[PDB]
Design a protein around this ligand. Structure first.
Ligand SMILES: [Fe+3]
Ligand SMILES: [Fe+3]
Ligand SMILES: [Fe+3]
Ligand SMILES: [Fe+3]
Lengths: 198, 198, 198, 198
């Protein structure tokens, strides 16, 4: 249906001291809400274009759709990938899947950390499942909608946009990327992997 | 396992005169095979990097992975989306789904056509299924890996890279985009749509 | 010689309250300095590649060079486009050129503002001289190095990367885009325009 | 005034057999012409936008402006960089400048070639003059307006868009990149170089 702003499963300051409540608030109620509106409007402008049978602005409408919808999609998984009861390491299948796919959980951690801290502009680090080769792969996302193939199922995202850590970490993006591991909700990622493999 | 070049379901000149056998031979045996090799190589360079604990070239590795795997994925669906006993219009769920999401089939076709012919460089037009919103949406893909969100399930793709139409239609790509409709394998799209909703 | 981090022609807090001294400090000593080190590194990397006759990482070296040199080029102009004893309005040559190119300073200001506040990720708003058509145009720059032609002479830049106003304005980027006009150094732009027309 | 399609300084088939007369007519008369009209169209919509005080499509107008203006700029220099009486090596200042900046003319050829043949989608190889560092550098241009800094003076360009060699070289882009050195108009590049360092 219409896109909507999801409700957080924890209080804004439940991730402190890893992630400030101040950022979580602005991030959620300001930033994320902006993409949900942008996604809904994009879908509405396209409805109109088809009705009036005028696609002179197709490029703009398609960019707005992809940008906002991807913005919305990314943030939705981001809030679920975070937990106050998080951290530690993944267990079972997922733990086994990550070890076979990246050699070790530490090697996986390293690659994810490097993809997240070397983005040139806004972006993300993403762990996803490739349906084609049936493999767990890490992708370096540019902005919200670029640098990955179609049909990839996202499992774990790390928001590398400046607004995700600036207020707190300032320019030191690697301290924020290291902190992230302390609030990862592996139960949600395990659930995602199980759904992707089935 | 390794990414592999899928075999075609028809002889090279099965789609004539809409699509030349000459283009299909080169397209398949040269272009597509090059992406498969690149995808496998990218995955191999990442294995090496993790083994050496050296991610100085993570940006390059991640770009080579996304570019080639996306090229491989895009072309694997392309070949299945085409059929000499194709053309017509979709039927069943797909027909109703398309009609109930774009107004009509013709309104869908007009938008797809507009997205396919206004790309500013290499790209594709794509019919995808959004899992968060549960909507059928059209996206305008730049290159192979850009301008769309994560989790989108591709249903129907239209390759708008110059090599896909140049030998036959030269600079008149809108003529190639029109001919495309005569060879679409709706049985394949219907099949992908059923799996995406199930 | 190597690229260098230029000195500010004013104290870090000279722009308050329009732009905080804390942002100016970080911006200058941390961000800008990073691009200078990155362009020098890219340049050296290419020297070594040429000496070793090995261009296996040509894509990465060209990307690192473009991104960091453009980051360095944009910030260098940005520092010079600001002044504590500036803002308000341009005169003589450019004042006439701007009204002729955009109808009025106010119409010019509105499009500049619109270009600055609608970027989809990190970017800039830029006023440049097109040598080919001998026209004054405004460009919407993506990141540091994208969305503009070769040969464009930059005259006035507005940094829209989140790190440019986040600490102070938070998510309200239009309030920062508006406060920018109070510190523009018209003399510097006026000077860049005569040289471009020369 | 308006942007115009420049006339070629030679007959369409004057570059044979290095570059077909067929590709030259299509390239010039069809492709280049579209970029000229697209740039003039973009400039007009922006005039209209300013008149109606409506910048709701500013992202689209700025992208169409950049893409087409860049398309037009790149091809104008392309026609001038080619010559039937071309080839050989650069002499005088330029020769010494290249050797000084790249080690040798052959080390320059190798880098330029690699940059040209590794583009992931549409792009160009370009030799430019960096006004800031006063350095001669090679950039790997994506599409027509991406992957290079502002203020860069283009000297020599190599069109790597598929429509530039497909009809004749098919998928073998490296054979076309090699053939290129046979029609390079060093008299033009030397002239551009003198103007840039002036
Ligand atoms: Fe975010
Ligand atoms: Fe293709
Ligand atoms: Fe900045
Ligand atoms: Fe071209």
């Amino acid at each position: 249906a219409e896109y909507t702003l999801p409700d957080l499963d924890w209080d804004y300051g439940a991730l402190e001291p890893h992630i400030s409540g101040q950022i979580n608030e602005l991030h959620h109620s300001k930033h994320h809400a902006t993409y949900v509106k942008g996604a809904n409007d994009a879908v509405a402008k396209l409805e109109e274009a088809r009705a009036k049978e005028d696609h002179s602005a197709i490029l703009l409408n398609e960019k707005n759709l992809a940008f906002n919808l991807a913005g919305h999609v990314n943030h939705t998984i981001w809030w679920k990938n975070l937990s106050p009861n998080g951290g530690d390491k993944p267990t079972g299948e997922l733990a086994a899947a990550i070890a076979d796919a990246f050699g070790s959980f530490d090697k996986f951690r390293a690659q994810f950390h490097a993809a997240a801290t070397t983005v040139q502009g806004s972006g993300w680090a993403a762990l996803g499942w490739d349906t084609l080769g049936n493999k767990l792969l890490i992708f370096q996302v540019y902005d919200h909608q670029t640098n990955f193939p179609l049909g990839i199922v996202p499992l774990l995202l790390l928001d590398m946009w400046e607004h995700a850590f600036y207020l707190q970490y300032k320019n030191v993006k690697v301290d924020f990327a290291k902190a992230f591991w302390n609030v990862v909700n592996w139960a949600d990622v395990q659930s995602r992997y199980a759904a992707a493999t089935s």
